[PDB]
Amino acid sequence: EGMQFDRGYLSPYFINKPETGAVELESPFILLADKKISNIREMLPVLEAVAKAGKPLLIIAEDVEGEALATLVVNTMRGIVKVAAVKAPGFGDRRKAMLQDIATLTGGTVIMELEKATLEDLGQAKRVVINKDTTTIIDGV
């Protein structure tokens, strides 16, 4: 078991374990962004980095929307990208506080400019399970 908050996948097309309707990510990297992501040009640096490392990425942001989400989803559907996205839990100051808690458990840093983030700022966990209503981070670094 591990940490679990009540936020599910941003797109049902992130699912890779349909028999359970879940997204299971083994040894993923974790991005904690206290902002709404909409431009893909913004995340390219981090997407390039985790791709060289050959590990999946979990994006936990205030919201991931529009073009960014569209690209993430479509590329996942083709298999060119191994990523999943969910909204950050809580509201107001509680959101920020909870974001740091997740950062601490995984060893990451809550984003500084998103364009200049690295694997060093990313969190890590042994496994992550995401369904329609929740996200469970298992064994954080």
Swiss-Prot record:
Lineage: Bacteria, Pseudomonadati, Pseudomonadota, Gammaproteobacteria, Enterobacterales
SS bond partners: none
Family in the record: Belongs to the chaperonin (HSP60) family.
Domain-related comment: Each subunit is composed of an apical domain that binds non-folded proteins and GroES, an intermediate domain and an equatorial domain that binds ATP and is involved in inter-ring interactions. Forms a large central channel that appears to traverse the entire length of the cylinder with no obstruction. The central channel of GroEL functions as two cavities, one in each ring, that are separated from each other by the crystallographically disordered 23-amino-acid C-terminal segments of the seven subunits. The entry and exit of polypeptide seem to be restricted to the apical end of each ring. Modulating the volume of the GroEL central cavity affects folding speed in accordance with confinement theory. Small proteins fold more rapidly as the size of the cage is gradually reduced to a point where restriction in space slows folding dramatically. For larger proteins, either expanding or reducing cage volume decelerate folding. A stepwise reduction in cage size results in a gradual loss of cell viability.
Organism listed in the record: Escherichia coli (strain K12)
Subcellular location: Cytoplasm
Summary of subunit composition and partner proteins: Forms a cylinder of 14 subunits composed of two heptameric rings stacked back-to-back. Interacts with the co-chaperonin GroES. Can form asymmetrical complexes, composed of one GroEL and one GroES, and symmetrical complexes, formed between one GroEL and two GroES oligomers. The asymmetrical complex is the functional unit. It was suggested that the symmetric heterooligomer may represent a transient intermediate in the chaperonin protein folding cycle.
Annotated positions of the N6-succinyllysine modification: K87, K126
Function: Together with its co-chaperonin GroES, plays an essential role in assisting protein folding. The GroEL-GroES system forms a nano-cage that allows encapsulation of the non-native substrate proteins and provides a physical environment optimized to promote and accelerate protein folding, probably by preventing aggregation and by entropically destabilizing folding intermediates. Also plays a role in coupling between replication of the F plasmid and cell division of the cell.
Processing after translation: Phosphorylated reversibly during heat shock.
Name of the molecule in the record: Chaperonin GroEL
